[PDB]
Write a protein that binds this ligand. Structure first.
Ligand SMILES: Cc1cc2nc3c(=O)[nH]c(=O)nc-3n(C[C@H](O)[C@H](O)[C@H](O)COP(=O)(O)OP(=O)(O)OC[C@H]3O[C@@H](n4cnc5c(N)ncnc54)[C@H](O)[C@@H]3O)c2cc1C
Ligand SMILES: Cc1cc2nc3c(=O)[nH]c(=O)nc-3n(C[C@H](O)[C@H](O)[C@H](O)COP(=O)(O)OP(=O)(O)OC[C@H]3O[C@@H](n4cnc5c(N)ncnc54)[C@H](O)[C@@H]3O)c2cc1C
Ligand SMILES: Cc1cc2nc3c(=O)[nH]c(=O)nc-3n(C[C@H](O)[C@H](O)[C@H](O)COP(=O)(O)OP(=O)(O)OC[C@H]3O[C@@H](n4cnc5c(N)ncnc54)[C@H](O)[C@@H]3O)c2cc1C
Ligand SMILES: CNc1cnn(-c2cccc(C(F)(F)F)c2)c(=O)c1Cl
Ligand SMILES: CNc1cnn(-c2cccc(C(F)(F)F)c2)c(=O)c1Cl
Ligand SMILES: CNc1cnn(-c2cccc(C(F)(F)F)c2)c(=O)c1Cl
Lengths: 472, 467, 470
């Protein structure tokens, strides 16, 4: 769609935040023939996908990011930039750890010959160590009405927690604790007793819609260089501007209530025909002008609050003999998903030294604790996953170095009844627009959600071209 | 053809005989040269002093052998195949003398007849084992050609573990099937081999149905092909071993030099010999071409075919093939019951496949017969004793083939050559060549049909090269 | 903007040249050779004893501008061993004796040629010289339109019409006809001889001859392959094209190889001999004028004989020799003329056996016997048919029953341009429309002309690539 029409006069759109939402807004506005001015607060691109190179030349990330087959807007973007080969697709499997049997792992293998949802049904049927046959029947009974259900049905489930809905549908409490604790922490870094059922249903839709919807991929290197730079190069080649260390301090308003300019941290005033806030909901809420604060659209945002998360990186002296070229569900009380980045990531490949990147969730009682306290808790959990290779007192494998990245306000906490509060990309303020994973879009608080919100934002701006050009 | 091609074929096995048959049908002149004084190759048989036949192997014809069915029909010898009951009879190693079977109902179509057979059988698989086995195999049977080719990287034992098929099922059922198809255990055999064999059970209704030839293969099967080739102007010559592939200065074939020095020439040349013999006869100037260099992976597997004539007629026998489920033996049959020409009402003869034979091809005939009698004492405990206390051996025949069919180990499929070689005028035939029906009689016949097809496709280029 | 992927069938001089100039233009050629040797009709093979034997005795001329350019571009000019500016002919009437046409290096063209004929007294009488000069003067003064008009006559026919004595046609032109197309003047087109005689009047050293310093696959074909590969091009041996698979509109879908492999590109080139192309032309193309005309162009039989003798011949030349034999054409002592084939105590004779129509079917021993009988006339005090004198250590007989197209009269309108009426399909080879005959120069020029036509159609070939992508 972002090819049609060539503007008489291109719009100058000021975008606050160069995360995937801001980068996507800038990409599709540039494709439409407009001039985006992307202003990033930090000295790094990507936001919640940002990474940094330390003194030894090793990268550490904000988080462990997994790309799914059921990410259509991400697939389109990678294809449009011709970087499809930068996604390292792994085996169609879901490998889970055994808390009862340390060092042992169980898995759900999706046959490449069976279509969706048969490959999924088969994976559950074939697995014998994570679910009993009666549990499998009760689980299938509980989920069948949900999978047959439409979009109206999944929206109606936003009033329940995962634990609440599973009990109502008769799904055994052991299934919710065995399988769904892992899935809840993976999607929103919180347990099923807090997470909205609508979140799990959009995730389970990956398993029944497309055949490879639930198939996983790792980026071949650090996201700022391998993903963010191709978008920046594309935006700049079409006349767009991308500026780092440009934090917006204030949204200055005209007497009628519309935006006058975006005042930067050094006082610099940036103007445009349209203004976009592609910042996280927490930062936007603090920067909303007093005169907007009582408008329903901005007042509803009080429900959407960032969830704490910690991303731990540990470089070991040895190469671990028992590892996978995949993502692993630790099924730990302290950890969520983890991966041996020296095996899964191309740019992070090392044949004699293995690095483990792990998501530490729930992180509410841990974001305040010291890095050594977090590493100790991680090593204690790793001694359960690698009992013959990793010991907490470094008796076996030894830590060369570590990197603990804390995000106390990451993605919005997808608790029940957040969906009516989620704003559309077009705001009731003429000339002001919103972008970000938290905005109204159907693919959760994810990389796909961020990119889609950007596409939806750019779409709303080009739709209002006539009104935005006359206002200039 | 304006002018018929003279095609020189080396080896009168089923591949060479098939190449000659279909080239003669196309109106060309095949010259089939056989090294030995017998036709058939790995299906060859010999008549001893007492007038009794002994074979290279126990051969079973399947319903899922379309090119074999076509050939028999074309020669009008369909009645020479003795189709047995649609059953799979297996011995019980734990219960000596006892047998279990998978009966395929003739009213149920494929794969329902198969599903029923497994469901009905209660002594070879437990109900949980049946479920895990069905789960493990269902994605595979639904899979296409690209899927089965992707399984060539795994052994049978490896793939069964991955798909969650119980280890007891792999040891109970698949040891028997692996030794039957390629004379090796599932820890060595490629999974692609088992998947092509299991496709017999789900494609056609009678695909897994078995048949015995009504007599010795040289007379009952090879002679009808020879008579057909000769009636259309083709030549079939025994005791004509090719000693050398003589080349022209450009690298193409000049002639085939025989053992007595005789030079045989043609417009096209075919090698329908086993891969082991071809590898030794490849000229030095061809040896580094990918097509011929890849052949190093394909090596013949040892096998032994034992024949034992007993003084009595065994009271407990079948008009069928039996899976011994032995560590030394593979499939066996009472040929005095199953084969028409070998029928004897007072004297029963047992033809048994001795596999794996790696540690046995070097051993003496008496050592092999002793091991066979010790295994027969487990299958017939009230009729056969190793010290000949019960039934007594009148005579025996031990036929050893130390390099039979290629050992279908994982990753052999990319090495398998097409019937058309990169050398202009030179072609290959044989069960080892690129064809979808394994190293079998069907594979041999299909490779022959595919070879003859490639020669007639290149008629224009082969006729111009002659002048 | 985006380099074209051009699939070329055949790594002869035409295919190698097409690949070389497409790589120079910044495109990606994929050169597929059917055999395990490069060069085609210039291919050679090393036997067990380490001695090379060739498809033919190849002579490079000064009047080969595209060959000179290629050698210069690859920096291998020193690989051509230029011989004396002479034309040495044998005397059939006087066995062992030789006559020659010496071209003075002080006289320019065609004066050096006129002088050579005037100075020679044993091959032409003074009246014969006058009648020959009279008969040829209108022809040498004539333009390109004139030489094309002579394609309707045989050499024997035109010589009789222009009043050139019948003895001149039999003495001088039998040798020249067999040298250029391995056929006698009663069959060869006069246009062929006129393009050859143009070597003698255009450039001073046009008629000067050179031998390659070694085997052509290593000394000439490898430098081209190394150059193509260094610029991103692909060269693959044992890749015979089995079928030209077509799209529903008639254009090429892919080239199907002998091992089943399907090779695709933005453009497709057939640098194969005309005989092989004619057999591979799809049925739907067979009635198009361009491909139907090719029925006239048929490969001519030729035999290249190599004989290694026990002794080094005392009476030999560091040159090419015209045997003026009824069975043989040109010959050379390769132990003298070729650098890599040099041997001081053992001499090797490489001889062209033409006309070969009645000989390609005969045995190697039958051919060697006929060659030894003819060599007993050229070396009567050194070689005897019953090996009484010099003895054969070994021999190599290379038969090409369909070599260069038989340049009989009226073949010129049938010769195709490098750009075919099929969009994306192109032709290369000595038989295609180019002015330097069925020669090494013709092959290289056709390659240059093919690569030129492909780069000229870059815009149309790049757009067609993306239209199919949709
Ligand atoms: C530990 C972790 C693991 C994750 N795993 C996955 C996964 O497996 N799969 C998946 O799909 N998603 C995953 N995500 C989520 C994903 O990272 C986010 O959904 C997405 O990147 C958010 O996009 P965004 O553009 O809306 O916000 P952000 O990426 O956070 O971008 C906002 C940007 O605005 C900038 N900014 C802030 N204030 C200002 C200001 N005043 N002026 C200017 N700029 C400003 C920020 O610096 C930032 O660059 C994970 C996230 C984390 C933290
Ligand atoms: C014990 C045993 C049991 C078997 N059971 C079965 C079964 O149940 N079902 C089934 O389908 N298949 C079975 N087979 C396999 C089957 O026999 C073969 O797949 C098939 O016969 C091989 O065909 P072929 O023509 O390619 O090779 P071959 O039959 O081996 O033919 C090659 C021929 O070339 C000849 N030759 C060799 N060297 C030269 C030379 N230099 N010059 C000229 N001729 C030469 C040989 O003498 C031989 O006749 C069995 C094989 C064995 C040994
Ligand atoms: C005896 C002899 C003497 C000669 N003397 C001279 C001389 O003195 N001077 C001179 O200038 N010229 C001479 N020539 C002629 C010269 O060799 C040719 O004119 C020239 O080499 C032909 O070039 P070409 O590339 O078009 O064809 P070729 O060199 O014949 O190349 C065609 C190539 O295509 C390959 N091919 C065929 N089919 C397929 C397929 N299906 N798929 C893929 N590849 C395929 C062939 O293997 C070959 O390599 C002589 C030739 C001979 C035989
Ligand atoms: C912060 N959002 C995230 C974070 N992780 N995953 C995720 C990663 C791996 C595995 C899974 C799961 F399979 F559980 F769905 C989800 C997401 O799908 C989303 Cl939407
Ligand atoms: C040497 N090849 C062989 C040898 N035997 N059988 C065979 C014979 C009897 C039973 C079975 C089985 F039922 F196991 F497939 C296979 C083959 O199907 C092939 Cl392909
Ligand atoms: C097959 N083509 C050939 C073959 N040989 N010569 C050739 C070689 C030596 C001498 C002469 C002659 F002097 F006669 F022209 C021609 C050619 O000029 C061409 Cl075009």
């Amino acid at each position: 769609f972002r090819n049609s029409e060539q503007p008489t006069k291109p719009l100058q759109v000021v975008i606050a935040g160069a995360g995937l939402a801001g980068l996507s807004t800038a990409k599709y506005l540039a494709d439409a023939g407009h001039k985006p001015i992307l202003l990033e607060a930090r000295d790094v691109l990507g936001g919640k996908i940002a990474a940094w190179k330390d003194e030894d030349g090793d990268w550490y990330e904000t988080g462990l990011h997994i790309f799914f087959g059921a990410y259509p807007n991400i697939q389109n973007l990678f294809g449009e930039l011709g970087i499809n080969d930068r996604l390292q697709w792994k085996e169609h499997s879901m490998i889970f750890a055994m808390p009862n049997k340390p060092g042992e792992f169980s898995r759900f293998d999706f046959p490449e010959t069976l279509p969706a949802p048969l490959n999924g049904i088969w994976a559950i049927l074939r697995n014998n160590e994570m679910l009993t046959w009666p549990e499998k029947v009760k689980f299938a009974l509980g989920l069948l009405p949900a999978m047959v259900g439409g979009q109206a049905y999944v929206e109606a489930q936003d009033g329940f927690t995962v634990s609440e809905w599973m009990k109502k549908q008769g799904v055994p409490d052991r299934v919710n604790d065995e399988v769904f604790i892992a899935m809840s922490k993976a999607l929103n870094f919180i347990n099923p007793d807090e997470l909205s059922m609508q979140c799990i249903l959009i995730a389970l839709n990956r398993f029944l819609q497309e055949k490879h919807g639930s198939k996983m991929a790792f980026l071949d290197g650090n996201p700022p260089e391998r993903l963010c730079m191709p978008i920046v190069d594309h935006v700049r080649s079409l006349g767009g501007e991308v500026r780092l260390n440009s934090r917006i301090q204030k949204i200055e308003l005209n007497p009628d209530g519309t935006v006058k300019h975006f005042a930067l941290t050094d006082g610099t005033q940036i103007t445009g025909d349209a203004y976009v806030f592609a910042t996280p909901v927490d930062i936007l809420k603090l920067l909303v002008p007093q005169e907007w604060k009582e408008i329903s659209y901005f007042k509803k945002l009080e429900k959407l609050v960032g969830v704490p998360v910690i991303n731990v990186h540990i470089w070991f002296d040895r190469k671990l003999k028992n590892t996978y070229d995949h993502l692993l569900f630790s099924r730990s009380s302290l950890l969520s998903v983890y991966a041996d980045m020296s095996v899964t990531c191309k740019e992070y490949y090392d044949p004699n030294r293995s690095m483990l990147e792990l998501v530490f969730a729930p992180a509410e009682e841990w974001v305040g604790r010291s890095d050594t306290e977090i590493i100790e808790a991680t090593m204690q959990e790793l001694a359960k996953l690698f009992p013959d290779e990793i010991a907490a007192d470094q008796s076996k494998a030894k830590i060369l170095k570590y990197h603990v990245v804390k995000t106390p306000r990451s993605v919005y906490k997808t608790i029940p009844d957040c969906e009516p509060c989620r704003p559309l990309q077009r705001s009731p303020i003429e000339g002001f627009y919103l972008a970000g994973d938290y905005t109204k879009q159907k693919y959760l608080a994810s990389m796909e959600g961020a990119v889609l919100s950007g596409k939806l934002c750019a779409q709303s701006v080009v739709e209002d071209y006539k009104m935005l050009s006359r206002r200039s």
